[PDB]
Enzyme design. Structure first.
Site, PDB file in Angstrom:
ATOM      1  N   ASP A 101       0.813  -1.145   0.061  1.00 17.57           N
ATOM      2  CA  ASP A 101       0.116  -0.146   0.098  1.00 17.57           C
ATOM      3  C   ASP A 101       0.783   1.332   0.220  1.00 17.57           C
ATOM      4  O   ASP A 101       0.151   2.477   0.233  1.00 17.57           O
ATOM      5  CB  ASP A 101      -1.209  -0.080   1.177  1.00 17.57           C
ATOM      6  CG  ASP A 101      -0.576  -0.031   2.505  1.00 17.57           C
ATOM      7  OD1 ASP A 101       0.796   0.222   2.656  1.00 17.57           O
ATOM      8  OD2 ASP A 101      -1.454  -0.445   3.436  1.00 17.57           O
ATOM      9  N   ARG A 158       0.985   6.759  -0.258  1.00 17.06           N
ATOM     10  CA  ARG A 158       0.102   5.918   0.742  1.00 17.06           C
ATOM     11  C   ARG A 158      -1.286   5.806  -0.085  1.00 17.06           C
ATOM     12  O   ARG A 158      -2.057   6.809  -0.096  1.00 17.06           O
ATOM     13  CB  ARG A 158       0.093   6.129   2.153  1.00 17.06           C
ATOM     14  CG  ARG A 158      -0.684   5.302   2.980  1.00 17.06           C
ATOM     15  CD  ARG A 158      -0.348   3.974   2.945  1.00 17.06           C
ATOM     16  NE  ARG A 158      -0.909   3.346   4.075  1.00 17.06           N
ATOM     17  CZ  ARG A 158      -2.034   2.594   4.324  1.00 17.06           C
ATOM     18  NH1 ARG A 158      -2.760   2.569   2.981  1.00 17.06           N
ATOM     19  NH2 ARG A 158      -2.840   1.928   5.253  1.00 17.06           N
ATOM     20  N   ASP A 216      -5.984  -1.200   3.461  1.00 15.21           N
ATOM     21  CA  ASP A 216      -4.700  -1.642   4.217  1.00 15.21           C
ATOM     22  C   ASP A 216      -4.155  -2.755   3.832  1.00 15.21           C
ATOM     23  O   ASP A 216      -4.997  -3.942   3.803  1.00 15.21           O
ATOM     24  CB  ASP A 216      -5.129  -1.623   5.734  1.00 15.21           C
ATOM     25  CG  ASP A 216      -3.892  -1.868   6.684  1.00 15.21           C
ATOM     26  OD1 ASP A 216      -2.766  -1.521   6.574  1.00 15.21           O
ATOM     27  OD2 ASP A 216      -4.243  -2.509   7.809  1.00 15.21           O
ATOM     28  N   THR A 217      -2.933  -2.887   3.223  1.00 16.08           N
ATOM     29  CA  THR A 217      -2.453  -4.248   3.068  1.00 16.08           C
ATOM     30  C   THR A 217      -1.651  -5.000   4.220  1.00 16.08           C
ATOM     31  O   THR A 217      -1.095  -3.980   4.872  1.00 16.08           O
ATOM     32  CB  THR A 217      -1.505  -4.123   1.951  1.00 16.08           C
ATOM     33  OG1 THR A 217      -0.392  -3.347   1.984  1.00 16.08           O
ATOM     34  CG2 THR A 217      -2.070  -4.086   0.653  1.00 16.08           C
ATOM     35  N   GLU A 240       1.678  -5.824   6.350  1.00 13.16           N
ATOM     36  CA  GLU A 240       2.926  -5.794   6.397  1.00 13.16           C
ATOM     37  C   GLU A 240       3.901  -6.817   5.786  1.00 13.16           C
ATOM     38  O   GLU A 240       3.415  -8.156   5.708  1.00 13.16           O
ATOM     39  CB  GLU A 240       3.632  -5.316   7.623  1.00 13.16           C
ATOM     40  CG  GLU A 240       2.954  -4.073   8.385  1.00 13.16           C
ATOM     41  CD  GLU A 240       3.041  -2.758   7.706  1.00 13.16           C
ATOM     42  OE1 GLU A 240       4.062  -2.514   6.949  1.00 13.16           O
ATOM     43  OE2 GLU A 240       2.078  -1.892   7.918  1.00 13.16           O
ATOM     44  N   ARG A 292       3.643  11.424   3.520  1.00  8.65           N
ATOM     45  CA  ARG A 292       3.267  10.461   2.303  1.00  8.65           C
ATOM     46  C   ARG A 292       2.207  11.158   1.769  1.00  8.65           C
ATOM     47  O   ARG A 292       1.349  11.924   2.258  1.00  8.65           O
ATOM     48  CB  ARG A 292       2.952   9.161   2.889  1.00  8.65           C
ATOM     49  CG  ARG A 292       4.128   8.574   3.853  1.00  8.65           C
ATOM     50  CD  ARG A 292       3.633   7.139   4.336  1.00  8.65           C
ATOM     51  NE  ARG A 292       2.532   7.033   5.030  1.00  8.65           N
ATOM     52  CZ  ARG A 292       1.892   5.975   5.676  1.00  8.65           C
ATOM     53  NH1 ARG A 292       2.533   4.681   5.445  1.00  8.65           N
ATOM     54  NH2 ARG A 292       0.944   6.217   6.331  1.00  8.65           N
TER      55      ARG A 292
HETATM   56  C1  LIG Z   1      -4.299   5.787   4.742  1.00  7.22           C
HETATM   57  C2  LIG Z   1      -4.003   6.605   5.886  1.00  7.22           C
HETATM   58  C3  LIG Z   1      -3.180   6.408   6.766  1.00  7.22           C
HETATM   59  N1  LIG Z   1      -2.894   7.601   7.604  1.00  7.22           N
HETATM   60  C4  LIG Z   1      -2.408   7.223   8.816  1.00  7.22           C
HETATM   61  C5  LIG Z   1      -2.783   6.575   9.839  1.00  7.22           C
HETATM   62  C6  LIG Z   1      -1.985   5.633  10.431  1.00  7.22           C
HETATM   63  O1  LIG Z   1      -1.361   6.242  11.808  1.00  7.22           O
HETATM   64  P1  LIG Z   1      -0.304   5.316  12.642  1.00  7.22           P
HETATM   65  O2  LIG Z   1       1.074   5.086  12.170  1.00  7.22           O
HETATM   66  O3  LIG Z   1      -0.221   6.323  14.019  1.00  7.22           O
HETATM   67  O4  LIG Z   1      -0.788   4.150  13.170  1.00  7.22           O
HETATM   68  C7  LIG Z   1      -0.980   5.200   9.394  1.00  7.22           C
HETATM   69  C8  LIG Z   1      -1.467   3.865   9.006  1.00  7.22           C
HETATM   70  O5  LIG Z   1      -0.472   3.615   7.984  1.00  7.22           O
HETATM   71  P2  LIG Z   1       0.254   2.298   7.590  1.00  7.22           P
HETATM   72  O6  LIG Z   1      -0.992   1.289   7.442  1.00  7.22           O
HETATM   73  O7  LIG Z   1       0.892   2.541   6.215  1.00  7.22           O
HETATM   74  O8  LIG Z   1       1.058   1.949   8.592  1.00  7.22           O
HETATM   75  O9  LIG Z   1      -1.067   6.466   8.647  1.00  7.22           O
HETATM   76  C9  LIG Z   1      -3.517   8.639   7.464  1.00  7.22           C
HETATM   77  O10 LIG Z   1      -3.334   9.856   8.350  1.00  7.22           O
HETATM   78  N2  LIG Z   1      -4.248   8.900   6.615  1.00  7.22           N
HETATM   79  C10 LIG Z   1      -4.623   7.918   5.609  1.00  7.22           C
HETATM   80  O11 LIG Z   1      -5.650   8.230   4.868  1.00  7.22           O
HETATM   81 CA   LIG Z   2      -0.221  -1.530   5.816  1.00  4.56          CA
END
Ligand SMILES: Cc1cn([C@H]2C[C@H](OP(=O)(O)O)[C@@H](COP(=O)(O)O)O2)c(=O)[nH]c1=O
Ligand SMILES: [Ca+2]
Length: 129
Positions: free
Chosen positions: A15, A29, A34-35, A37, A75
């Protein structure tokens, strides 16, 4: 929403991807998904799926939603297209991502993606197997 050009710099995982957008390298991103890890079950398969989709594409595009365009890690937040096919939707349809992280005001494609998820769950694919 509208599609904008980008080019692949490097695949990262299910993702996230590194793209050049407006001439600058950025990690994107994928919205609304959500994929797993890479270290988790189906992580390597999600990674391979999006690496292949992006690397085989003649034309990559990004589409921003109405809300936040970058997240707190810097991102970019977009829907990603490979020769017109939405990567976010394709992952969900194959059972390699779950619909997730649905924030109000960046959720234009939510119902499209939920309909794909229902299909993948019916077919018992990958994560739903
Ligand atoms: C997809 C997405 C993730 N995020 C943030 C929420 C999550 O915070 P935390 O890092 O505090 O958990 C994280 C999840 O991404 P990842 O799934 O790449 O880890 O990215 C956003 O803020 N907006 C979004 O649209
Ligand atoms: Ca992920």
């Amino acid at each position: 929403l509208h599609k904008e050009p980008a080019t692949l710099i490097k695949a990262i995982d299910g993702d996230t991807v590194k793209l050049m957008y407006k001439g600058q390298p950025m990690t994107f991103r994928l919205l609304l998904v959500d994929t797993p890890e890479f270290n988790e079950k189906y992580g390597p398969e999600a990674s391979a799926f999006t690496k292949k989709m992006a690397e085989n594409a003649k034309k990559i595009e990004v589409e921003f939603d109405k809300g936040q365009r970058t997240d707190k890690y810097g991102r970019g937040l977009a829907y990603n297209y490979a020769d017109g096919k939405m990567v976010n939707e394709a992952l969900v349809r194959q059972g390699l991502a779950k619909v997730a992280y649905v924030y109000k005001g960046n959720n234009t494609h939510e119902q499209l993606l939920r309909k794909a998820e229902a299909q993948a769950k019916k077919e018992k694919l990958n994560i739903w197997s």
